[PDB]
Amino acid sequence: LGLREIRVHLCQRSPGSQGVRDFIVQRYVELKKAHPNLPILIRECSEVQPKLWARYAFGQEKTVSLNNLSADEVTRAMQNVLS
Amino acid sequence: TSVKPIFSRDLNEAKRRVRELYRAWYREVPNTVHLMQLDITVKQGRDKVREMFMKNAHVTDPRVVDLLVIKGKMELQETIKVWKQRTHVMRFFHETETPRPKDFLSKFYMGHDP
Amino acid sequence: GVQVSPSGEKITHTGQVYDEKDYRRVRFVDRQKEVNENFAIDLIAQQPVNEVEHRIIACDGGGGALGHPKVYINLDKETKTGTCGYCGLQFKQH
Amino acid sequence: ILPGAAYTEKSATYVNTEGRAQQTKVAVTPPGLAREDWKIIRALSEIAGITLPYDTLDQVRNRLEEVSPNLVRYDDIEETNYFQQASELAKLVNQEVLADPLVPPQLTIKDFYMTDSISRASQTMAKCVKAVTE
Amino acid sequence: LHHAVIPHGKGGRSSVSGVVATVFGATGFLGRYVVNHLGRMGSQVIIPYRCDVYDIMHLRLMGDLGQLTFLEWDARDKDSIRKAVQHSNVVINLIGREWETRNFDFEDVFVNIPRAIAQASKEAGVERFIHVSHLNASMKSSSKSLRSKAVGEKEVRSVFPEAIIIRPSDIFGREDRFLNHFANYRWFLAVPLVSLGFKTVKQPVYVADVSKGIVNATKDPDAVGKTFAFTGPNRYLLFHLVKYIFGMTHRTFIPYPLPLFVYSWIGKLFGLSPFEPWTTKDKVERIHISDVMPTDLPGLEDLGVQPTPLELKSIEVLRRHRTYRWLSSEIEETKPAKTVNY
Amino acid sequence: QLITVDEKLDITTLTGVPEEHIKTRKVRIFVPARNNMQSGVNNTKKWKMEFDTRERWENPLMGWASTADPLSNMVLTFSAKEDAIAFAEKNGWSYDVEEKKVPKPKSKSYGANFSWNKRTRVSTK
Amino acid sequence: KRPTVRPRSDVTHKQLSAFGEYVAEILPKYVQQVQVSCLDELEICIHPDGVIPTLTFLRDHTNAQFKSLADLTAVDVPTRQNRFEIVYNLLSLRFNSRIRVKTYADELTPIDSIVSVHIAANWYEREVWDMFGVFFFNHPDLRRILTDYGFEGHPFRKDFPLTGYVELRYDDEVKRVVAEPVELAQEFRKFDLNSPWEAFPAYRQPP
């Protein structure tokens, strides 16, 4: 039912993940301030297509493949996850 | 890609030989349960034939199929003749091996194997 | 050292004896377990020290080519004594 | 009690300080009726009504991929970033530091040889302690 | 749980199971299958015997090194039983004759020997005890065998509760005394049957099913204080059963009726035999009393065994009796037997 | 003449092994590490291909070590790595490849042991 | 002159090198890599299509009457994609000499048979098929020899376990010599014996 974890998956040099780095450096601090008790895991790798998992109360995991996205659309889809 | 054949231009011309071999086995089973006094019925012998055929239905390489046809003809020779005894034929059925459990929890109850 | 356990079995120089609940005591029913009574620990303990004059000597078994390889043992220590690796004889100097 | 297996007796992943994930290889099977840990949890699950999706080791490794994909990357150290973000996000909280010194627990070699379960149940480490303290 | 009892291996030879067992009627027709099924998966099997060492040789095999220990005993001599059950988890009783002898009566086989073994097993501290009575065993019966088995089934429960009592029907196997017994009525030119065999119902079971059931009963956490009806499927009628035997064995079939008293007298005079006799009064009675419906007892399927039907295994045992001109003949030339439910 | 076979070279229907030791099994392709007792490195230089280990147990008679798998004492050797991947893909084994571990070259100097300023001035000889 | 080492001549080496040039330049459509060893054993290596022509040549040619087949082996080397190195040891009886013809194969690249040249090759080709899995074309019988009738596997392949995948024993339940899977009371103890030191610099593989 309720949200329990988000976890962000991305790359450091691959450009399809570009948008998640900018989104992080821009909005991650404000987002954590808005949701301090909540965690959001950021685990990056060499060559992985980005994702955004979210785990609700039971083992209910739901993804969106945010490959080759902007930063504003990343924020929009993340707010869609939160809401 | 770009390899030599054996007895088969393509897979359909191999399935031809496959069906010839299935035929020879189907026509041989009633004579083998009779000559050497097996204690089975002809129905389950032929079901064993179809089982040991469908044990290799995933294959698509013509060369592998031709080699399997060759080995089937060898076993058919051995069985048409009595070069092999009741022991070897009833070896196929596994009349003593308990069924390998195809379930997780049973394997966990007995053994560390996957 | 062929003292027995309370389960009645003889104990070997490799102290081995089966437990009471160990089902592997069956095989000694109407039978026994072979154990050698002559323990080499107590036997080689029943052997005196061969005093010598030098700080370095050699040891073979005593037959030469029928014993063991020649090894040299130092005898500078006085609190304890020398010991061969193959055999277990002991040496000391005055 | 549910008897588990030691690092010598299961194929598993252990991440070091650097973040390098490293793969154990099974050397000796575990004794008695002891079994792997995740195997036990999956069996308990099937006994209950959850019946977790995976049933082998490759599947659990793929699940580890789903959670943190750094862990299937064996011996492949990964370059992290975003320390400035942690700094901005940690300067916010304000908790005083005590006027207390900070001594470590492992101060002498006496305290080094027994800090574990395997280490605490061992004759050699106990012998080394007996040697140092005497 | 000693470490030597932990089951290691892939469930086969040269492995370990934790089924350290004594099998007392091991030198017989059912004991050989029990020992084979215990040794096939890895388990030590103590085999007490009185027979010559020549008649334990087929048992000398069927076990890896050490997993088969033999030692001699005497039912008259207590202190030969504690010797055996001192080291075990399980004790399996398969002792039973089909005839009395000048030394051993039926009480002294089906009552006193189980009771002795059970006292010794409750003193030793074994965890299980598998007794093997009969399906028809009842104190209100016509045969001395069945009533003695009832007495023993009761007294074993009294002295050793947490026991297991398996009640098979007429078992058939290669060296049985049931199907071969019917088939050996050809030397005499006709088979007698009380009431022409009708009004008699037989539900026979294969040996391997009984053996697998015993071998799982010594491992199942359930089956600790419970009876069992090892019956097999396909309740047959005795006339049609013998007809199927004499069709599989392609000889002939000249049946005729015979009252129970003259057939009993025949059994008696055939029982006057210093050797292993052929027919006896109690065998006749046991042949001519129907099998009980097992509908109020668990059976094989509640223990992990699919009953093999007799039409699947009969040729293996009955080809020994076929002549040339019929030996090389298949199972599908015998018009199988009519069944009943009753 | 020739044929155009696309699919992966597969041989398991020829090898005469059970499905068990094909599908269940896992394979480690690697160069073995040098024994740190010996300073020699010739036991390296060849890619090997071992199998996963399985249950051994104490034989109840003497205490010998028993097995239920025949691939226990199994070792192959390959001059290269792609040969090993090929053999495994061909025989139907899932593999894990451990890359080649080569020691770093290093700058030795017997004169650094007798320096005027550095900490390499060893107190011994 | 040195006693412990083996004596050495050169005339055999020169003769066999000359005959190697002979075969190499007379039969170029098939021949690869003629070689003569320290011990003078000539060794010609052949494309698998050249088997019958080369063997017929060495049998029937006048200056090469290699009309006796001594061995017909095979050698599994899992590294190379064409695993099975197949060997043909021959002798002449006219020149008191031997030669070795070699070819290569794979699990699915069989070779023409040689009964049309050397009838001795019948049972050897059968042995090679049984042991290594090399099929031979236009062979009369080509069944197993050495393995049991109901036998899956090519044992002398290097990827085959020494102890096998099946084991036999008699069972009273069925009165047959059934075949159970393999379960040994003592695992074969593999020993790691090779020393970590270059013993022979002459064969030193460079990287």
Ligand SMILES: NC(=O)C1=CN([C@@H]2O[C@H](COP(=O)(O)OP(=O)(O)OC[C@H]3O[C@@H](n4cnc5c(N)ncnc54)[C@H](OP(=O)(O)O)[C@@H]3O)[C@@H](O)[C@H]2O)C=CC1
């Ligand atoms: N058709 C069947 O087999 C059926 C069997 N059962 C039950 O199965 C069990 C065994 O059947 P089965 O195997 O046919 O019996 P068997 O006659 O085939 O073998 C019986 C065993 O009992 C031993 N035995 C008999 N009398 C004595 C004695 N006085 N002292 C010591 N040992 C003795 C014999 O050992 P030795 O040979 O050394 O004397 C023999 O091995 C019995 O409990 C019987 O009631 C039930 C229904 C049908």
Ligand SMILES: [Zn+2]
């Ligand atoms: Zn000495």
